[PDB]
Amino acid sequence: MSQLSNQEKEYLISKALETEEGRVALAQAMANPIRVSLDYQGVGRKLLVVDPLPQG
């Protein structure tokens, strides 16, 4: 209450400070920094991988 005699206003305002400075915090769910990155030249990748080796 802005009176001692009882009345309120709620929509009439002045001297705003820290308006539109809110956020919504987001939990980490990255994988890009967790693998290694290197620059490369080419327009596609060819990869070779080894399969199960014989044993016994």
Binding site: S5, N6, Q7, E8, K9, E10, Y11, L12
Partner: protein, 150 residues
């Protein structure tokens, strides 16, 4: 000494909104019921409204009054079809409300004709603009907490 007016300290009872006129049916293009008209729960101005009348300021939420009275738009002043408000904040049932637009009895607030500006207690008073659009009953001088048929 010391007397509250509006803001949930006045009791305006309850009134029936399915009384007078044609009565539509339950459908969408409604809006939400809360205290505050752009506010949040437990923070809202309030007229002498009970059941009937509530005007959006920001968002698609309603509670009583608040919106320039030079131009009323949205399809009527919004009325309730087949739920009767159980608060005296004007509307603030806490549900999504399906609204209508048939002729339907309302509760008014503020002295004199609405054709003015908004008082930030939840009322209409005369502004610098005159011969602006009125609400409900015409030809008849309206006062604070009159019962109008739209």
């Amino acid at each position: 000494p010391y007397v509250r007016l509006g803001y949930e300290g006045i009791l305006n009872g309850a009134h029936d909104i399915d009384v007078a006129g044609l009565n539509g049916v339950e459908q969408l293009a409604g809006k939400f019921a809360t205290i505050g008209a752009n506010g949040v729960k437990l923070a809202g101005d309030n007229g002498t409204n009970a059941v009937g009348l509530f005007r959006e300021d920001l968002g698609d939420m309603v509670n009583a009054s608040e919106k320039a009275s030079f131009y009323f738009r949205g399809g009527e002043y919004y009325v309730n079809i087949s739920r009767t408000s159980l608060t005296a904040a004007g509307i603030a049932a806490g549900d999504e409300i399906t609204c209508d637009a048939d002729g339907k009895m309302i509760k008014f607030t503020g002295t004199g004709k609405a054709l003015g500006v908004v008082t930030h207690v939840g009322e209409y008073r005369a502004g610098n603009m005159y011969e602006k659009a009125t609400q409900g009953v015409t030809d008849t001088d309206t006062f604070i907490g009159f019962i109008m048929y739209v």
